Amino acid sequence: KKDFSTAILERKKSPNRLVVDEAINDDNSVVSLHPATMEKLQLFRGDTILIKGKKRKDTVCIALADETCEEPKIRMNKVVRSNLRVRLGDVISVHQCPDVKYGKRVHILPVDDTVEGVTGNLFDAYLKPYFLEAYRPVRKGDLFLVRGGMRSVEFKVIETDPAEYCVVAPDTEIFCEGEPVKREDEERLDDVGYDDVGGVRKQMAQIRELVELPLRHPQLFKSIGVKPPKGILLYGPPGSGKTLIARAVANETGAFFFCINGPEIMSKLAGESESNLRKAFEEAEKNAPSIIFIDEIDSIAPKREKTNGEVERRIVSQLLTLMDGLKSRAHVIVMGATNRPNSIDPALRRFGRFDREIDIGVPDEIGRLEVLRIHTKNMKLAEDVDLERISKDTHGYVGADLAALCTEAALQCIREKMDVIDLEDDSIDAEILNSMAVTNEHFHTALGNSNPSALRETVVEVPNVSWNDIGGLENVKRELQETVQYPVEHPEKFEKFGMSPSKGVLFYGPPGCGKTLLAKAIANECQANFISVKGPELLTMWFGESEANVREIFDKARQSAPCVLFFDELDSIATQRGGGSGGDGGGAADRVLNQLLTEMDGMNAKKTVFIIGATNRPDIIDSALLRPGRLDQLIYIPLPDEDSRLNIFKAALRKSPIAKDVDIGALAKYTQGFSGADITEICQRACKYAIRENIEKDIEKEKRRSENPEAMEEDGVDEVSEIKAAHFEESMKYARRSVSDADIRKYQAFAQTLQQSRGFG
Amino acid sequence: SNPSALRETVVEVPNVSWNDIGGLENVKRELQETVQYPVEHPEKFEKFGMSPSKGVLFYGPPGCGKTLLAKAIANECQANFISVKGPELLTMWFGESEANVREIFDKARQSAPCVLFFDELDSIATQRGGGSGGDGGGAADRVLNQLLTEMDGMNAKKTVFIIGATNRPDIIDSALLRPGRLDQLIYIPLPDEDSRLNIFKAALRKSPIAKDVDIGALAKYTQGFSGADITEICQRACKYAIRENIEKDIEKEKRRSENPEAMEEDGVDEVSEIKAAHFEESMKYARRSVSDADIRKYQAFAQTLQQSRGFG
Ligand SMILES: Nc1ncnc2c1ncn2[C@@H]1O[C@H](COP(=O)(O)OP(=O)(O)NP(=O)(O)O)[C@@H](O)[C@H]1O
Ligand SMILES: Nc1ncnc2c1ncn2[C@@H]1O[C@H](COP(=O)(O)OP(=O)(O)NP(=O)(O)O)[C@@H](O)[C@H]1O
Ligand SMILES: Nc1ncnc2c1ncn2[C@@H]1O[C@H](COP(=O)(O)OP(=O)(O)NP(=O)(O)O)[C@@H](O)[C@H]1O
Ligand SMILES: [Mg+2]
Ligand SMILES: [Mg+2]
Ligand SMILES: [Mg+2]
């Protein structure tokens, strides 16, 4: 089996599907099909055909024959590619045009920017010389290019007869009647689509199967005897993808789309907001199938505790009544968008309303890369821009932030060219304008000068850490496999033996021994999402979103199953219940303790969700967290031993320029009782010393050359500046253990007597 | 899919029976008198001109089966069971406020007969601080005083029994032990040699245990272990067996794939029963959750718990 969640997105290869390719002819009403492809299509040489494009756009052209066109090719020209909205490499479908429909009229009008420089009737110069007796097929809404000399005027197919498409026979009596098709109309063409949304595939698949399927193929649901949900609610960080995704789905499904912007509704006088809502719903019902996208729904339907006026609760109630009135099932779907899912009134998040919710969260590396590719598809990038590096460096960047980053890169490119650009002149040199290109350094500078927005939001992603990055801890990994991986990859195994596992683990040990890394590594092994939460972050949550922060992170973990919810730095929240119970500063630790235990109680029934903790202070750890049904498994992470420290050094320096004479194993003997953090700080000090050394070396070399320029560039060239043993010796000189010999036997004692904390002392 | 009404109080008869609980014969015998008789036979007490008490407190080492006894006695009497934990009560005040404890008690009244169990009294029933103060503990003080107030009005409802459970009898507020409240005191001891065999059997009553595993043998070696430790031993053993049979199946499939001509021999996946080796390995890492110094103290409290309403 496989994960069939992302199955609707898959394109089903068919004999009628041909890949896009360049044509041998620039004819706009004629393409060229390979003879074999035509035979599969039952077509013949020079036969009109309908090409199915993207965004519900299609054109009509006569297919020729040529053996150079490989089987998975169609050989269309640039104009057809633009009309279909398909770039090279897309997979269009081909259908026949048996009804050639020799048209009596083919209304043709020009575009203003393609007419600049025409001093004669366009009908007698462009249209008639190429259409009369040519029998060129024409598809309404497609821009065919024409030439009548030096100027090239492109006309849109305004109004054919038949209306859809026809063939331009000699009987087509028509001329150019005015210029009403100015180029600015392109703002509503090629606007949005599936290809314009990147970084979301699971959410996009969910939206498509909840919106497009009920509206295009309701027969499936009717036969299965299930009524599909009518309420969808997109939510996520501001600027992520919501309004784009809604419009993309609406345009791709080809259903009547009505946008109800919250500010627009609330900016009108009382009695017009409700009137507009009623009109929108009525029009959607009349023109079914339909979609009603309510952007910024939080403004028109905020939490009832926050809304003050009566003409706001009235609008909320009107919206609720209208949604309740949609149970007629007139192929109408109401989709929402709100960055504040909790700010929404609870009534909306109920059956018969917005009951199905999709979280358009922060994208991962591949998503950011795809977003950047989408946004830079039009910019004049140079041949040395590496978007992979930028995507790796852009952590916490939503799509809007990436678009702003591209814009800032372009601006920085302009600033570099400001020296050769004079602002006083009302016009800029054409050659200078066309020679501006965005380089990688511009992007790096823009990224340095740009800041992320969704850097505080919880991130649900598979960590990149593997077992290799962690040195030693073989037994800990061996037991973690049993505790986590087996009940996830093989859940039925436990049911076979009639015994359920435990969904809780606690890591206790000296600081810097690799407790945070183990959680990430085990998540990576099981390919399960990882949610990182720190005690300091939890403590500020109560002074803020309050009760709905811990509940929210746990709900997110539930929605993201399988998951590994890690609570680092339990030394603060899990502080043992004070004997003199009191205070509000610790009344937040008591909250993050009791409310957290309450959620732990309800989490054992979810399955495939494991709650892992980490504490450097097992003495103060609340004994309640150790209860069965909670973090009861206790795993001790010891200080690395002689063998483990070699692995730790190697991992810390797995990508370092270390010299050939450095004995990694030698340091292990001298560094005993040092945590992994100290072992990494040793390497950091060594790297800093090497940087100092090679900085001084390069400075001395350049100063030697400048102290008599006649001195030529000798064979001496900048070297690796590898980390010599001297640097490691100097680092070990200042290196100091972060765990004392008196603070290790105590950890051993707690390893012995930790779970006994639920009783007396 | 995720549930929605998973935080709401559930008023249902638990599925736990006396069989799931090992040992504790005397505790069950006295619980019958304390609970079942005044419910099934209410007129009996009126016949003798003496009313019973609607309060019980379970105090003992953790993992000895205090939560299970309440559910079992509810199941025996076919009475509804309402489970409330101290951590849940503490967050109620920062929320619905006064109308959470009142609401659970009203629900218990409406659901009579009922067994209102307050697990984890170690937090709400924290002894009234000598230096009374603070708002973090001002929630424990609330869930204490407001709870006692409801207990006072609950003795007239009849067929409603309030049971508590505390692993820290030292800090238990002396007010909860007053007559008209949780005044009956029942001590749940650590299981003895005979009880541990029953606990193992119950934990493994639906397990594939092999024919050579001596359940009684483990009982001798595991002394001072709570029932939770006895169940974690079985959990470790099951995990080891899962590892063993996972590796066995992987090796078998890899053997077949390392030359597909090798046919499917008579060897087929077996029960993968829990062999004695798994139990030995589990006992290797098994560690008591109750120390020998933290059992004599429970005995001392069994002796001198109800004397907490006076001085120290
Ligand atoms: N996944 C994406 N792929 C491509 N462009 C994107 C993507 N996400 C965002 N953008 C770009 O960034 C813009 C901002 O996103 P938008 O769709 O307005 O977000 P929003 O969630 O509706 N914002 P708000 O209502 O202010 O919280 C879009 O209009 C695109 O130009
Ligand atoms: N076993 C290890 N192998 C390799 N690097 C390690 C190891 N342990 C610690 N480190 C390094 O030291 C850093 C700190 O350790 P970390 O994994 O954050 O432990 P922690 O328990 O979260 N520490 P603290 O929050 O300070 O108590 C890691 O991110 C690594 O760079
Ligand atoms: N007498 C017993 N017989 C069988 N299983 C038992 C017994 N005592 C404890 N257990 C097992 O151990 C688990 C924990 O015991 P439980 O009945 O929750 O005691 P508790 O007093 O609520 N513990 P705690 O809240 O940790 O102080 C039970 O759910 C059973 O799985
Ligand atoms: Mg929006
Ligand atoms: Mg930690
Ligand atoms: Mg209890």
PDB file of N, CA and C in Angstrom, chain A residues 621-653:
ATOM      1  N   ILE A 621      11.763  17.604  38.914  1.00  0.00           N
ATOM      2  CA  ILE A 621      10.729  17.174  37.984  1.00  0.00           C
ATOM      3  C   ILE A 621       9.507  16.726  38.770  1.00  0.00           C
ATOM      4  N   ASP A 622       8.342  17.248  38.397  1.00  0.00           N
ATOM      5  CA  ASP A 622       7.113  16.883  39.087  1.00  0.00           C
ATOM      6  C   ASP A 622       6.878  15.384  38.976  1.00  0.00           C
ATOM      7  N   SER A 623       6.538  14.762  40.103  1.00  0.00           N
ATOM      8  CA  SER A 623       6.314  13.324  40.118  1.00  0.00           C
ATOM      9  C   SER A 623       5.080  12.925  39.320  1.00  0.00           C
ATOM     10  N   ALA A 624       4.172  13.866  39.057  1.00  0.00           N
ATOM     11  CA  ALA A 624       2.972  13.544  38.295  1.00  0.00           C
ATOM     12  C   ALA A 624       3.310  13.195  36.852  1.00  0.00           C
ATOM     13  N   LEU A 625       4.320  13.855  36.284  1.00  0.00           N
ATOM     14  CA  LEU A 625       4.713  13.583  34.908  1.00  0.00           C
ATOM     15  C   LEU A 625       5.205  12.157  34.718  1.00  0.00           C
ATOM     16  N   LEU A 626       5.619  11.491  35.790  1.00  0.00           N
ATOM     17  CA  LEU A 626       6.143  10.136  35.715  1.00  0.00           C
ATOM     18  C   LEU A 626       5.059   9.078  35.833  1.00  0.00           C
ATOM     19  N   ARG A 627       3.799   9.485  35.925  1.00  0.00           N
ATOM     20  CA  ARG A 627       2.717   8.536  36.095  1.00  0.00           C
ATOM     21  C   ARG A 627       2.502   7.724  34.819  1.00  0.00           C
ATOM     22  N   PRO A 628       2.042   6.480  34.944  1.00  0.00           N
ATOM     23  CA  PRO A 628       1.608   5.743  33.754  1.00  0.00           C
ATOM     24  C   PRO A 628       0.492   6.488  33.035  1.00  0.00           C
ATOM     25  N   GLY A 629       0.492   6.380  31.708  1.00  0.00           N
ATOM     26  CA  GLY A 629      -0.331   7.240  30.887  1.00  0.00           C
ATOM     27  C   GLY A 629       0.279   8.596  30.618  1.00  0.00           C
ATOM     28  N   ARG A 630       1.505   8.819  31.074  1.00  0.00           N
ATOM     29  CA  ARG A 630       2.223  10.071  30.901  1.00  0.00           C
ATOM     30  C   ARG A 630       3.675   9.697  30.633  1.00  0.00           C
ATOM     31  N   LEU A 631       4.585  10.636  30.868  1.00  0.00           N
ATOM     32  CA  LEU A 631       6.003  10.389  30.653  1.00  0.00           C
ATOM     33  C   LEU A 631       6.553   9.440  31.709  1.00  0.00           C
ATOM     34  N   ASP A 632       6.231   8.152  31.600  1.00  0.00           N
ATOM     35  CA  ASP A 632       6.622   7.187  32.618  1.00  0.00           C
ATOM     36  C   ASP A 632       7.896   6.434  32.264  1.00  0.00           C
ATOM     37  N   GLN A 633       8.146   6.163  30.985  1.00  0.00           N
ATOM     38  CA  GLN A 633       9.430   5.594  30.602  1.00  0.00           C
ATOM     39  C   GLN A 633      10.536   6.590  30.916  1.00  0.00           C
ATOM     40  N   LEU A 634      11.592   6.112  31.565  1.00  0.00           N
ATOM     41  CA  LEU A 634      12.694   6.953  32.010  1.00  0.00           C
ATOM     42  C   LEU A 634      13.981   6.456  31.375  1.00  0.00           C
ATOM     43  N   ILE A 635      14.583   7.293  30.538  1.00  0.00           N
ATOM     44  CA  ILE A 635      15.810   6.965  29.826  1.00  0.00           C
ATOM     45  C   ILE A 635      16.889   7.930  30.288  1.00  0.00           C
ATOM     46  N   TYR A 636      18.008   7.380  30.745  1.00  0.00           N
ATOM     47  CA  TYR A 636      19.116   8.168  31.262  1.00  0.00           C
ATOM     48  C   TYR A 636      20.151   8.358  30.162  1.00  0.00           C
ATOM     49  N   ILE A 637      20.484   9.613  29.873  1.00  0.00           N
ATOM     50  CA  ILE A 637      21.485   9.948  28.865  1.00  0.00           C
ATOM     51  C   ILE A 637      22.781  10.275  29.601  1.00  0.00           C
ATOM     52  N   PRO A 638      23.775   9.393  29.595  1.00  0.00           N
ATOM     53  CA  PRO A 638      24.985   9.619  30.385  1.00  0.00           C
ATOM     54  C   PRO A 638      25.967  10.546  29.678  1.00  0.00           C
ATOM     55  N   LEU A 639      26.952  11.000  30.445  1.00  0.00           N
ATOM     56  CA  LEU A 639      28.069  11.707  29.846  1.00  0.00           C
ATOM     57  C   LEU A 639      28.821  10.761  28.913  1.00  0.00           C
ATOM     58  N   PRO A 640      29.247  11.227  27.742  1.00  0.00           N
ATOM     59  CA  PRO A 640      29.937  10.330  26.811  1.00  0.00           C
ATOM     60  C   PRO A 640      31.214   9.779  27.423  1.00  0.00           C
ATOM     61  N   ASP A 641      31.522   8.533  27.081  1.00  0.00           N
ATOM     62  CA  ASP A 641      32.711   7.864  27.580  1.00  0.00           C
ATOM     63  C   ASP A 641      33.845   8.037  26.569  1.00  0.00           C
ATOM     64  N   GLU A 642      34.954   7.328  26.785  1.00  0.00           N
ATOM     65  CA  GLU A 642      36.112   7.477  25.909  1.00  0.00           C
ATOM     66  C   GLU A 642      35.746   7.193  24.458  1.00  0.00           C
ATOM     67  N   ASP A 643      35.011   6.106  24.219  1.00  0.00           N
ATOM     68  CA  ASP A 643      34.653   5.749  22.851  1.00  0.00           C
ATOM     69  C   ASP A 643      33.650   6.734  22.265  1.00  0.00           C
ATOM     70  N   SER A 644      32.710   7.213  23.082  1.00  0.00           N
ATOM     71  CA  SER A 644      31.677   8.111  22.578  1.00  0.00           C
ATOM     72  C   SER A 644      32.248   9.467  22.183  1.00  0.00           C
ATOM     73  N   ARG A 645      33.270   9.940  22.895  1.00  0.00           N
ATOM     74  CA  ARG A 645      33.799  11.271  22.627  1.00  0.00           C
ATOM     75  C   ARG A 645      34.500  11.339  21.279  1.00  0.00           C
ATOM     76  N   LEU A 646      35.139  10.251  20.850  1.00  0.00           N
ATOM     77  CA  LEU A 646      35.722  10.227  19.512  1.00  0.00           C
ATOM     78  C   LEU A 646      34.641  10.420  18.457  1.00  0.00           C
ATOM     79  N   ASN A 647      33.522   9.708  18.607  1.00  0.00           N
ATOM     80  CA  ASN A 647      32.416   9.863  17.672  1.00  0.00           C
ATOM     81  C   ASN A 647      31.854  11.276  17.720  1.00  0.00           C
ATOM     82  N   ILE A 648      31.768  11.860  18.917  1.00  0.00           N
ATOM     83  CA  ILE A 648      31.251  13.222  19.041  1.00  0.00           C
ATOM     84  C   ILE A 648      32.162  14.206  18.320  1.00  0.00           C
ATOM     85  N   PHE A 649      33.477  14.073  18.509  1.00  0.00           N
ATOM     86  CA  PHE A 649      34.419  14.940  17.810  1.00  0.00           C
ATOM     87  C   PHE A 649      34.280  14.779  16.304  1.00  0.00           C
ATOM     88  N   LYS A 650      34.197  13.534  15.839  1.00  0.00           N
ATOM     89  CA  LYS A 650      34.088  13.286  14.407  1.00  0.00           C
ATOM     90  C   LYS A 650      32.822  13.920  13.846  1.00  0.00           C
ATOM     91  N   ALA A 651      31.702  13.761  14.552  1.00  0.00           N
ATOM     92  CA  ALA A 651      30.446  14.354  14.105  1.00  0.00           C
ATOM     93  C   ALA A 651      30.532  15.873  14.078  1.00  0.00           C
ATOM     94  N   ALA A 652      31.108  16.470  15.123  1.00  0.00           N
ATOM     95  CA  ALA A 652      31.253  17.920  15.156  1.00  0.00           C
ATOM     96  C   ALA A 652      32.143  18.404  14.022  1.00  0.00           C
ATOM     97  N   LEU A 653      33.085  17.568  13.589  1.00  0.00           N
ATOM     98  CA  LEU A 653      34.035  17.918  12.543  1.00  0.00           C
ATOM     99  C   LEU A 653      33.857  17.056  11.295  1.00  0.00           C
TER     100      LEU A 653
END
